[PDB]
Amino acid sequence: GSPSRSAEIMKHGYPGFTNVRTYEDFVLSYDYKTRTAHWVCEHLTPERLKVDRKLCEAKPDITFPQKFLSQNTDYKCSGFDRGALAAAGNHRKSQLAVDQTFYLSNMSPQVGRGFNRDKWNDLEMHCRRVAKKMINSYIITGPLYLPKLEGDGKKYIKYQVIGDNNVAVPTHFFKVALFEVTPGKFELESYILPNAVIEDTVEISKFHVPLDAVERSAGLEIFARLDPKSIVKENGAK
Template identity: 40%
Template sequence: MQPKQPAQFAAPAPRAPVQSPNTDNEFLKYGYPGPISDFMVRSRYAASYNRALRNPSWVAEHLTRDNMKGTADRALPTAPTSPFPEDKSLPEQFRALLKDYSGSGYDRGHMAPAGDAKINMEAMTETFLLSNMAPQVGIGFNRHYWAYLEGFVRDLTKQFDDIYVITGSLFLPTKNEATGKWTVTYEVIGNPPNVAVPTHFYKIILGVTGGSNFALGGFALPNQKIDSKTELSTFSQPIEYIEKASGLTFFDKVDRSNVTELCKQIACTLTK
């Protein structure tokens, strides 16, 4: 249920500067294949979308007591009538579509939750873009444990001045006991099948007080029904583990030698 933690991690190496591709060379004379990801900034989140998996690799939010206020509600008569629209900012052949989820047995799982974007209807509507979605098990996960975790993150704004949270999908290996080999296996939905179903989802949470006091926690949850009585700490993982698994670097501008573990500073308890 829970990915096994490596014994230890070395301090993360300095992050290499991002290099823009130089397409003026002989190897790319007739075209640049392009990135596999698209970067986007919305009203209440920024994200990187993986074209091959049709999943967000990561979605980043900044939560405060003030920006959690608002009354936007998709149930209002004035709300947009088209639920879960495709993201037309992406090339058409790489978009996730509403029909991909139809009959799949999976929910359209928010990475940036609608509950974090009540400040206005535009912000909330952007959270329903399919580029902010990934297939999640519904009963017991998306509609229950994952929703409790989203509420837990929002409640942290009562204890910290600022909450920065990064959410995304993971594809973790499992061991074949017969062969001893590790493999990554995941379902793909859609017609044709092109939207990957993550094996796990992660949240990285950074709480900031006074601009210089940091608390950091990372969680990796299996994409399956989870008993609501399961302690959140069950899914706690070193940030370095999730970085290695995702190929990403989280909050690299924060000195981790000067950071408190989130669940040692506050009670990591979910409210149902």
């Protein structure tokens, strides 16, 4: 007579089905190659946004094979923060839920000052703020590794890997948010931000992208279930 929490979270489709773990309050797909997530999916409602982040010491999720885990020593002295894809601030409903965002499977190496602690946090705060006035909200977040044109006229994907376990440092991060403003009607916002120092004055809407750019770059199918006729607003328009 009640849904599974994971069916509630994944109502609008799985971005992909690779190495999926269902936690107490979010769903994650893990990439054995990069040692960080392919994507995480979250479902917020006002009531669920109404515990501690302090009783939270990051650790590996050991239900993945040991040879494919990342560890604290990979992030230590690397210059990068442990950046949680499913934000701790989105899960205030029990200590277990929030603790689970501190699994290293939910972490990616992120620029600290100028990004994770700042602009990227502003994006996370923006989604909670909007979710509070919405009925249901669905958020997909993940790392990107994007090509750049180099001086030989060729395109290359280049990214750092850190630690003995070679954890990938994403070039960018995506976040797509689906907001249910009235029953069966949705606003859609898609963003791609660079994993780099972002000038604090830059508005988040500058990082708006077509949803197709996220999908094509990520190799994922986002909100596949959804009917395009149900979207009343995209990236702030219409």
